[PDB]
Every structure is written in C-alpha cells, then in structure tokens.
Design a protein around this ligand. Structure first.
Ligand SMILES: [Zn+2]
Lengths: 68, 242, 190
C-alpha cells in the first residue's frame, strides 16, 4: 500500500526491464500495451510490480526439490 | 604574407618572430630583385631562407631548423650569390618515439616525460620497445578513461592498434609490458601529478573508492543507471510509432 | 565534431512541426510508398529551429551535405523495418532536394569571390542535350590474380582506380552487368 512514486521512478531504471521493453518494441510494431502499462500511467506499472513480484523465483525451489 | 607567417610560424612544430618575418621578406626580395637567381620553385622557397635568417639576428640553432638534395645546393648558391621485443639491444631517438607517441595524437608534454625517462634510464636495458610501449599505454589508459568509461568498444581497438604497430599476434607480453612499467614508475611526483590531473586511480575516482575500501555499504556500485540516462532513453520510444 | 552536427540535423527530421502537424516525417513516410528515395525541403524552416548548421552549411556545404544524406538513410533504415513489422536489402542514398526564396543575384554581379559557396539567381533556359551517365557502384576483377574487389562513388556525378593490388599497372577490368550507374545532363542558362 505504501508504494510511493520515487520508488516507482527508481525501479524503472531496472535495465533488464528495458531489455523486456525493447524486446516487445521489436516484437510488436504497434505500441499499445506499453503505453497501457508504463510510467506514462503508473497504475499499470504498480500492477505489474505486484504481478511479477509475487513469483516463485523457481530457481530456488528448483534447487530445493533437486535436493529432495 | 599569410604564407610567410605560415611557414615562419611552422618552426615551433620575442624579437625572433618579428625579425624573422622581416628577414624572410628582404631575403626573398634580394633573391628575386636581380636576374641572377631563377628556377627555384616557390614550392620550397622559405626554408634555408629561414635558416640563414636564424643565422643572422643573434642566436642560431643547428637542430630543429632544417627539419634535401637542393637544400645544400640552394644554400651554397645563395651564399655565393650574396617481433620487436625478441630484438636485442635496439636504439632509439627523440623523434622516433615522438612518432610512436604522436600516433595517438597525445600531447608533447607526456612525450617529453617519456623521453626524460629514457635518456636517464635507457642505460641498463635489454629492449626499449617494452619500456616505451608500457609507458605510452599507461599514458593512454590514464588520460582516455572518459571515452572508455562510456565506450568499452575502445579497449579492443586500442590494444589491437599497438599489437600490430609492433607486429605481434601474441599479446600477453604486452600485458606484461604494462604491468611491469607500472611496477616500476609507480611512485614519482610527476606520475603523481598526472594521476591527480586525469584521475584514474586504477581507473576509478577517489571520492568513490575510499568508501569502496574503508569498509562501506554506501559505496555506489552503479549497477543502477543515472537519471539523465533514462531522461534521454525515453525519446527513443517516444517516436516508436514509426 | 561531425556527429554533433549529424544529431542537430536529425532532430530536425522528426522533431520539427508547424501548424500542429508533422511535415517531413510523414512526407518521408509517403515518399517511401512512392518508392521515390528523395524528398523536398525548405531551408527557411531550419533557421529558427537551429543555427548550428546554417552558418557552416553556407561556407562549407560539400563538407556537410553527404552527412545529411547518410542521416536520411539512417532514418530510412529504422522506419523501413518498423513499417515491415507493421505491414508486409537494397536501400541506397537518397538525393536531397531543397529550395529557397531569400534572394536572387544575377550573373552580372558575380565575381571570383564567394566561390564554392551557395548563391541564388534568375535566368532563362536553352539546353536539353543528352542523358549522359555516370557510375555509382561498379565491380572490378583483376586479369591475372582474378582478384575481385568493388568501388562505389557518391556525389561527384577525387580518386581513380587502384594502381596496384606480378600483375603490373592497370590490372583491372570494369565489369558492367553487375555495376550500377546514374544519369545527369548538362544544362545551360542565360
Ligand atoms: Zn592484381
């Protein structure tokens, strides 16, 4: 709930996020979802934040069930 | 007069400049007045003109003035009218290594410093190509950190340049050429002056590294990117429509 | 430096606008559908936008022009692929075109000053001589080495063939059927 704008700014400079961005720039000549989600509207941004934040990082659970 | 001042102020490459332009003027004058001095292409006609005008005023300097067949002819004619490191025990000069340093368009002050280094400590040697190689490399890495800090495509081009300027396919010897001079030249006040000037300190700034190494977490390892970067990266996708 | 000027120029391409509508951007987008490989330009439109190119294109134009050509080709190359990604290998330099109305100076008031600069003028036409051709890209094989190479020329429709790649001097034949050319004419005025 306390996800402030300055936090939203700095997380933008995730360079991997720029990789993802440009990968979709060249995957799609149109530019509709990126304007749907990007900092030009921060709602979709923070939405994506929690969306990709929740994930498992399956590497670690993989190491776990590998140990298993 | 343009061309006169050009060739006259070509000598560097108080009373001197003045008296020498006057000298060349009345010299060229005397030489062209009479019908005695002809078939002298103006291609070259302001050079031993300048040398004898050096000879005239007060002090003259044989070196760095004449710097050839007809040079002597016209002189008399006017004067009457009036790999690299396997090679063992090589030899070098002032201007040989001025060339090998001026190939990077580096300044002349750094070159004079390497020259002083040589002519004092070119005594106990095996091969000076190594020493001067390492020297000018550790001039480049210290002065060229900016362009390299933003362009890692440089470090391959530069080492490739000096790899073939001295004709080798193997290069780790060059790596040694750098680190050994760095072991050697490590602690002289002039080297010090250059390091405070152009600010490498292993290629990293002072106000950063001291917190890198004293024991801190505020140390800024810039994995993240700066704000102006994004401020200008945004324009690339602004016009993404096209 | 030159790339500073290149960017000062290429911003004028897509970051210029008047009467609240892009002009040259969509002009190019049209011209490429036309398969034209050129444009139209005004130079009046560049004076307010930027003074970093005018005073130097004036007195050193040929030094600056093929730069613009290459900038143009650069813009083309992105937009070509982007529009292929949108809907639906060989993209040469685009002739640039421009005009002006600042003034007109006559042949009589010329001199041997302001030579190699750019001048404006009036007159009347005579000639329609012939479509004389020049080259732009022409392949070369050596007669002994059988050593293929290639050459391309840019603006002057400076150098000649290579004098040596024993084969001796003049070792090169010019191939035509995989060579390229362009046209010009010799146009008069009075
Ligand atoms: Zn040949």
């Amino acid at each position: 709930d306390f996800l402030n704008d300055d936090y939203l700014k700095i997380l933008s400079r995730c360079p991997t996020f720029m990789f993802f961005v440009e990968g979709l720039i060249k995957q799609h000549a149109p530019a509709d979802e990126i304007l749907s989600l990007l900092t030009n509207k921060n709602r979709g941004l923070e939405e994506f934040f929690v969306e990709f934040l929740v994930r498992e990082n399956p590497i670690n659970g993989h190491a776990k069930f590998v140990a298993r | 007069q343009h061309c006169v001042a050009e060739v006259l102020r070509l000598d560097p490459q108080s009373g001197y400049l003045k008296k020498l332009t006057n000298a060349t003027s009345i010299l060229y004058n005397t030489s062209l007045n009479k019908v005695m001095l002809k078939q002298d292409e103006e291609v070259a006609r302001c050079h031993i003109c300048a040398y004898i005008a050096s000879q005239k005023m007060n002090e003259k300097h044989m070196p760095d003035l004449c710097y050839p067949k007809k040079a002597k002819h016209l002189m008399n004619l006017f004067r009457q009218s009036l790999s690299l490191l396997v090679k063992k025990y090589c030899k070098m000069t002032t201007e040989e290594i001025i060339r090998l340093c001026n190939d990077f368009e580096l300044p002349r002050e750094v070159a004079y410093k390497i020259v002083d280094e040589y002519n004092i400590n070119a005594s106990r040697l095996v091969c000076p190509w190594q020493l001067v190689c390492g020297l000018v490399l550790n001039c480049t890495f210290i002065v060229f950190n900016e362009r390299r800090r933003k362009d890692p495509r440089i470090d391959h081009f530069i080492v490739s340049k000096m790899c073939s300027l001295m004709l080798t396919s193997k290069v780790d010897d060059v790596i040694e050429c750098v680190k050994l001079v760095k072991e050697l030249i490590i602690g002289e006040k002039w080297f010090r002056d250059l390091q405070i000037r152009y600010d490498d300190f292993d290629g990293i700034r002072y106000d950063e590294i001291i917190f890198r190494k004293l024991g801190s977490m505020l140390q800024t390892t810039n994995i993240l990117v700066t704000d102006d970067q994004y401020n200008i990266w945004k324009k690339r996708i602004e016009m993404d429509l096209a | 430096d030159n790339t500073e000027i290149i960017k000062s120029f290429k911003n004028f391409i897509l970051e210029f606008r008047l009467d609240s509508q892009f002009i040259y951007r969509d002009q190019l987008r049209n011209n490429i559908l036309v398969k034209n490989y050129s444009l139209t330009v005004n130079m009046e439109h560049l004076i307010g936008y930027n003074e970093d190119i005018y005073k130097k294109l004036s007195d050193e134009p040929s030094d600056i022009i093929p730069l613009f050509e290459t900038a143009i080709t650069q813009v083309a190359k992105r937009i070509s692929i982007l529009s292929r990604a949108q809907s639906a290998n060989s993209l040469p330099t685009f002739q640039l075109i421009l005009n002006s109305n600042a003034n007109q100076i006559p042949l009589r008031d010329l001199d041997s000053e302001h030579v190699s600069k750019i001048v404006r003028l009036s007159g009347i036409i005579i000639s329609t001589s012939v479509l004389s051709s020049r080259a732009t890209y022409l392949s070369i094989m050596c007669r002994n080495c059988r050593h293929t190479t290639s050459i391309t020329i840019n603006n002057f429709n400076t150098v000649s063939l290579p004098r040596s790649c024993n084969c001796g001097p003049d070792p090169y034949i010019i191939i035509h059927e995989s060579s390229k050319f362009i046209d010009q004419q010799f146009l008069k005025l009075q």
